[model samples]
Target: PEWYKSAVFYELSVRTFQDGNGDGKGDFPGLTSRLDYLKNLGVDCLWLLPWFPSPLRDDGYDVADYRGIHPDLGTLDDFKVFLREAHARGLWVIGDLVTNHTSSDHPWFQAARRGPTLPDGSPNEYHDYYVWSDNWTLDEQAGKYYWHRFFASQPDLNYDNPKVVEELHGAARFWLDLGLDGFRVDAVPYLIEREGTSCENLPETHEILKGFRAMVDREYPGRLLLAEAFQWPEEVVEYFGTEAEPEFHMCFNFPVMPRLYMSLKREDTSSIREIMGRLPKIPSFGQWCIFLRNHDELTLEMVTDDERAFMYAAYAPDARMKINVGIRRRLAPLLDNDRRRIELLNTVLLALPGSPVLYYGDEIGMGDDLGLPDRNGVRTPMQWNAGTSGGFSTAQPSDCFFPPIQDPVYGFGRVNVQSQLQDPSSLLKWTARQLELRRAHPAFAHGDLTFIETGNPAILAFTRQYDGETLLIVSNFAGNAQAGLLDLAPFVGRAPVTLSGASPLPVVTGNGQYPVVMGKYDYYWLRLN
Candidate 1:
């Protein structure tokens, strides 16, 4: 029942996956059109970005209605068809379920803004549905608004209102009934911000979520509830509660992905080691949804705005490389299209602890349009072929939902899914094979992460163990080859096998010390017997 225990999640923006109707934008049918492709890549789950009806503001994160699909994405019937198709293919489907706030254009918000109370005269049934400051001016002077932390265009949902909570519980029930396997609750931590406090992860918010969990358990215990609490690692784990049967089944390991980039920058493993080392062990029922990039900004909100600006500047100097406070780029482009680096980083991700969520289009080394404004660059259409429109759809080149990556080196012709899918040694094929290996092995999923110390700053090493299975992971962050001797008394007697199936890996000789060497951006995943 716990498919998430060792799942490879493909995060698809339903608006840009595939265009079944040739209407340019992606829809449920568009996604349905690519079910076989995802299945071939060994993705056990499809973690869909929001496809719910919206004003297209905040990219569907500001939902106007949760019960229906956006007109652009077709109908609920289309999604039901997709759900059946995916499940038939042995794929579990989960989607973004935004509950923290609603768009200003939402009907309930309009009613609340006008009446500020309910028809029954119970404090305007919707009045308490959102946090309001009778004096933002006064609160500003007092240093807190006690409302939505992000934007006023999106009003916070009122968890204090019993009616509001009950309505959301119904929404969860409705979706679960329609065949959704689970949901990634958006902006969950701010549901009950209190005055004078940072206004996140409040006691009331957890209580409401716990109630929601009860409803889901009664109706659909097999389903998952993942909270998108983009906070520090320590605070993010709080959503899983104190026991195996906590509120949320999972919460994103938001800090880890960004820290991956930071590890490369600092050219040291201290920060990474320290962070992962600080992570408290969790119960068996809990898991972490991990990712490198998604449709939104890189979430520098975890760090200061100043530090974020510095990171964007240092990593992405070109204006065309920017996207919504983050670099409007893909993994390949971020590493300057270095094949070695791309494979190396992905190796760590695929073998890392918890569920690794792959952002759409990152597999085949697709690039983005710096020409597009805001976050539109990374959200561009998939590059399936070098033909017109990058073969994302049969639509005309001009009819594309977004521009194709036009750079010469990482251009459509040189880098795309259709071409790579045909090539046996292509990055897409390599990624698929690597994922398949992970599927065959359980150590990559539920094992503990025990980092192996290397005196060399450019090398990163770690080990994982589960039941009787053990694995060793090593990577070189620098261009020059480096070597280090690791203590292998733990697995010195066991035989080592390479996951890539390249060749037999060198096992640790006697227990004193063994040299492990790696070339630039090179890595190895060794399974020990």
Candidate 2:
């Protein structure tokens, strides 16, 4: 396992994390000024949302220039300063690399639309930069039809073109030279297209990623490349390549997220167990990046249509919370503002076999603005203090890009970081404590998992062991307290020591059955020795 396998990751949007320049939008200066907040939160890596120059569409995913910084965010020099500051604080920064597509206004795309010939009639080099077809029905503005997997304004790049590949690598190397640790490669599976196919997870796609991995390894050893592949676990593993030629160091576990919610709703662990059991083992250098929520919607693309409908009905009763077959609500609201349930989900994320990625503002239980379009509801500004616009910016509330959540229960006044920092029992404090506990145990990061049979569906029990160290994690999904008898034969005669509270549990002896009691959504991480 690599250091990333043990690292805790935090994801945040540049325009929403903090507004340091009082510009009503979060920038590198604002984010750089608050490194202490993230360090105190116990995050090892910062997976920043795209800050590349864009047309403010798709929340900056539609890149106009790969190497240029978003003017609203900051200058290239500002980013260098921020990166230096972050490294000094022992933190790694990873930017979003949207290689699949670029803004339609990009110079390459603009030239490609000129239809393989320039005004002077000389051979055009830029015409082959994007995927093009002779069929002109797709977009009349461009003489030839172009393939776009997403919004029309975002055009897919032609990976078949060696020049395009070189340019993309150039952009990557540009960032790597600027002190970036790596990139969270966006929409990786859709990089290449095949006729009569879904144009996903193709062999060419993996080869491209492998080339990227090889390039980075040869230049900057230990830098990570994480993939965003929202597919079933088995299919997603392709991005990890193999031990000999690994691609992404980490790929987000997309299927397990919705299963987690389903298990909680049904008060049964069957769903989670099914998903986890089907997950293919990865190379030693590869890892799964797990999270409860992220900048985008809580996606259900990995689940079936029935499961998607079930999730929608269960979590997003209000249609306003639904978007593109996923729920656009925050973690707190998805759990119905129940603090215990929220904590339970996060507890599972931390204990699971992956690098846990904490979404911005989730520690303090921020709410969403459903009235906002698309996934913007959950991407609101981070609530640093309880004030007009939640102290995200000194600018007037009307000047902000999106209004911060103002609901009474999960509002800035009730769930801001400043208040949480002052309250020792706040969720923010509890989250910090959980990260501390997880860091103290090596088994949680590098151990092999063994599911324990408790005979009760609501009780999910498992053990993680590495070398001679062992850890037991038991979680109850029901809304009521429950107790179960677990077989302790594997660890007979070993003592169970509480990790969170750092107390010693009674020793298991003679391979006897151990009685375990759990409150609603209660979880325990105990060290067995």
Candidate 3:
């Protein structure tokens, strides 16, 4: 809650960033080699996707062993070194913790049927490790019906059993003891299920989190526990426990994401204002983790049917770009590679009332491969250069984990980091500059948001104020230029300083009105005294 208030989080996938040994996979050594690049990107924290042992189902979300690192990624020792190096570079690393379910190949599930063996070859205790039911179809290997929210291959853990909670705590402590910063829990709301209900955000689930938070705080104070609860803000805030006791230090703002795209598509900020007004105030120590996109599909589960349809028609016109109930395209493609629109959306993400999460390869406007199945379309390799395999690996193009984007417009040759570094006006450079400006202002992070009503609906104007500092952000959501007048009587004599060039703008007078003129897709962060 302290450092994260001003932190710029970068979400990345190890398997797609870089391949160290040329085994066609991303390993810890390779990821470590890129820390300088990430640090220079102006990111304060790195949110690594699940790297635990898995069967590759659900992109490492179906974890097989929580205590062990994936062999393809690295060993436990390799992870320790990586963590040490990341801390040395002043970059906080938080790994994904998948507590809701485990791969069917996990020893606990196998032991439920085949019986587990201890080191002494005696029977172990895993018969009640997973949730068993008679309603679901039977798994031939386990020879019992198991409940799974996502896939049959991944069975839900039996949180009703105290042993399961203890095992998970042990796994959490294992990493925390190894100098790891913290965890980003996956699917927190679905941790428990009940009869004749939605089986999400259960009371028992919050109780478990409270106890877990207490454990972490008792042993390792200040370690963050981020909740991946994809529910409405009112419900999501419950993850951040009451004032007396707190659960998660932060919860992902799931509803605001889709509304961003909706607002951009409709060229109106009404939807965003409505959602922001509906969000309940969180605890002092609790923060909201806002992200434009992540490793998974751009979920539409939280939006209404009309909103979902509108998003689908506007962004994912192609059937391949739609997956499950969401869009599977990247930010660049979803915005049709319109640089101004992309910059406008990212500006909103950074200036919003929460920590901003930058998805991997998005800084340079990476493209997605919709031809791939499911959500893997946006999970392509990081294009670092224009060389073969896009500098992600030395392996043949076909041998790479996922082929680099070959589209001429957004391909490696056109949008790689090397080229962006050379060009002073590239998106990557612009993004880094914005981050640097954001770091200089605490209001962007630890401030209260107040939306100002401008007569022009195409203009979204808001003020973020904290301590004695105030910052005003205004942007045009339409493709055409727009003008608006805001009542700035709150600060009668304060002059506005444009953040772009640090140049002074018009000053407010006794008239109490501030005139604003913005071009198409134009945005400005004005520092007000």
Candidate 4:
């Protein structure tokens, strides 16, 4: 069975999480400081975005070296120490592993670019360390294979080379050897390339991943390997091989997050409904990782350029949303800081199949600074309190990694965790309560989700069931009270306990039909007895 099926994942960008040193940037030690915070938040697994040594061309996606930590972030020792602390707190720590390409600065790529090396003068050497056009002129002349969809600086690794396979296996062993619980393998599709093809999902790439899985199983048996296919969910499932033999243990559910926004923006569920219907049901050995927002800008990359441009124009609407052909705003900004919409989407995320991932700043209603460049807006420092540097750092104002949000509306000085912790009406408290409810009830976390059809697009409804426990869940889509009808016969014998600012038991009718009503941004986890 999948190790992550019922897991709650917390995603953090190490460089932006919290800094232990006064160097104005976050590092591994800073991450260790937040272990207690994460434990309190109730995430079983912490998925860290890339922190490998990189040129930062794609914000740590361009790996300059895969063996060590980026000096700017911390040293290898720091990572080891941090991992130990995470494990000490019963939190499994996973990191982003970029396997597809290396920054041009990588020694292998640098050496390869210069000339093929035998190192020890071995024969039949440098057969194919990467997917190189044996003769680019002829390949172009004869109409054949091409390069990566990413930047040219990111030269794809040559997985077809057996030696390259050993290198990757060694790399996996290296991290697992260092106490990391798992990995979010980056860009596995482009690992293997071929002629006259899009250079994705090549059969060999799957083979390589399977090999990695085998290595992990032999040495680090309980560890997980999540693929970052970023492809359609149907195609993405290929990463999670069959039960008889699996590759990656989990892959991100790409369509769910996008459709959540689509349904909100258009006030229609057709897009979401369609995707949900089409999503390949994952196997018991596999799990899906779904999130609201992360370091990467949510781009319509699967769409054509024209369609992508259309999406960019439609969703962004303001300069803050515009970022390199995608919208870079945080979850709160995307929902216009609408509590109803925020809670609505989250209700589904928590109830949906597979594991749910939460971005570092989203839970506290953290707002993005559109004034920041690229994905940097969402990457701003976490808002902990209203004190100095917004309680994100001890660094001076000028030394802060991110300028603290001070706007009267979504400012860090106002909307922070410290105040929310004591305030019963705060979103953090609401989210914490919801998390607690889900954590307490296996039906909500591991149950089957059945959408309860509703006529009002303003009301999204669903039911979660597992064992004999059944929950009628509902949420208001707009900033107003809304109601829907859920047939309760499926749960007639069970009593209903509504989850609100902490739950209150509710009386119901006998006809097997009950009106599921809630105030603005309200969510219900009603149990039937």
Off-target runs (Cα >4 Å) in candidate 4 are 1-3, 117-128, 134-149, 301-315, 492-495, 499-511
Cα lDDT tens digits, model 4, 1-529, are 3457778998888877787887778888887887887888777889888888888888888988778899978898888888888888888888888887777677765555533435576533433555655312113221323244578667677776789888888877888888888888888887776779877788888888887888898888789888877788888888888777779888887777776776665555556656666678766777778888887688676555765665666678766677665688888877878877788888778877768999888888888777777667778888888877777678865587777677898787788888888897888877877788778778765777777666566666667789887777766555567776766655555567755444555555576676666686666667666
Across residues 161-247, which tens digit of lDDT does each residue of candidate 2 receive? 999899989999999999899898988888888889978888998898999999999999989899877677787888899999889
Scored by CA lDDT, what does every candidate get?
Answer: 0.77, 0.87, 0.87, 0.75
* lDDT of candidate 3 at residue 484, scale 0 to 100: 93
TM-score per model over all chains: 0.91, 0.96, 0.96, 0.89
Model 1 earns a TM-score of 0.91
The full ranking of all candidates by TM-score, starting with the best, is: 2, 3, 1, 4
Roughly what TM-score does model 4 have, to 2 decimal places?
0.89
The collision pairs in model 3 are none
Error of 1 at 244 (Å): 6.8
- lDDT-based ranking, best first? 3, 2, 1, 4
RMSD of model 2 against the true structure: 1.7
Q: Any runs in candidate 3 off by more than 4 Å, and if so which?
A: 115-124, 133-135, 139-143, 195-198
In candidate 1, position 43 carries an lDDT of: 85
